[PDB]
């Protein structure tokens, strides 16, 4: 289909215009890091020449924005880790990429080490630890670096996350007080606060990165116990019978302190960020890292269930849309050689032309919610060799069974 080409071309036009006119532009979420990945993934196509040029332009632009306004964050989705991920594949092509990457890496270590030092536990909020803004996301990038000089950093973060699964105010740790919720409306959903149970912002994300850390060579008894405790909490608060393979977004103090779910949710959905699809990654990675066939078998059922149901799905975006679910299924097939999701993947690719044309102008061009995320997904069905590490940003680990 020649429609990816037209669409890409118009994304380049918008970004060529912007790159001679905002914090947002430098983020993986909505900005150039995402556009760089999308374009870099299209190398086999005829216009890779032009694409590498735009990529190099957009990198130029990024470094002069950094060397003027600096960086405030090391985060995967808003900061240095996402900028570094978007160009990691380019490292050995020229020293300009290597130098820039080394700068990003020193900044990250500085930033992480500084964030851990100043951390106040009874002010814990998801951007502290999570995938989008916190350490889990940062570690996801760092584990791609083999240079042994980041070992202490890796374990510093691993211990820190593990420690957050310990009991506190009686029992607690990763529990978020109501005033510590990310948004006004969330403070109001959870007047007594909660344990966030999503991949993007909650316990599943922390669990995944610890399983992935283990298989990359980075674990101890404390982290393996943390992983275990997390999967144990997922096994415990799983909803029942007809709501089987479902979890609420958050568990509240008393639910936790009585070990049974009490009040029922208003809105559960099937997303990468919250719900079954994301949660299946925890079971998959726990299962594989812990050598537990039950966990692995179950991850499959959790995802299979979500694909059948598509709860709250009304777009093709990555974060909480159908492209997200589809990409998680593609990972299962890569790691397990399962055929369980083959019809869902087939159907999506059959429908591709329509997906792009009806994609809103409304959610922008960016990775996490915009059309370029969707183009990444489509592009790797068409040509499955990944030139980039984009999937790392979603905790989709193609190297999970490659060793250390
Ligand atoms: Zn989302």
From Swiss-Prot:
CDD domains: LanC. InterPro entries: LanC, LANC-like, Nisin_biosynthesis_NisC. Coiled coil: none annotated. It comes from the Bacteria. GO terms for biological process: peptide modification. Could be implicated in the processing or the export process of the nisin lantibiotic. To B.subtilis SpaC and S.epidermidis EpiC. This is Nisin biosynthesis protein NisC. It comes from Lactococcus lactis subsp. lactis.
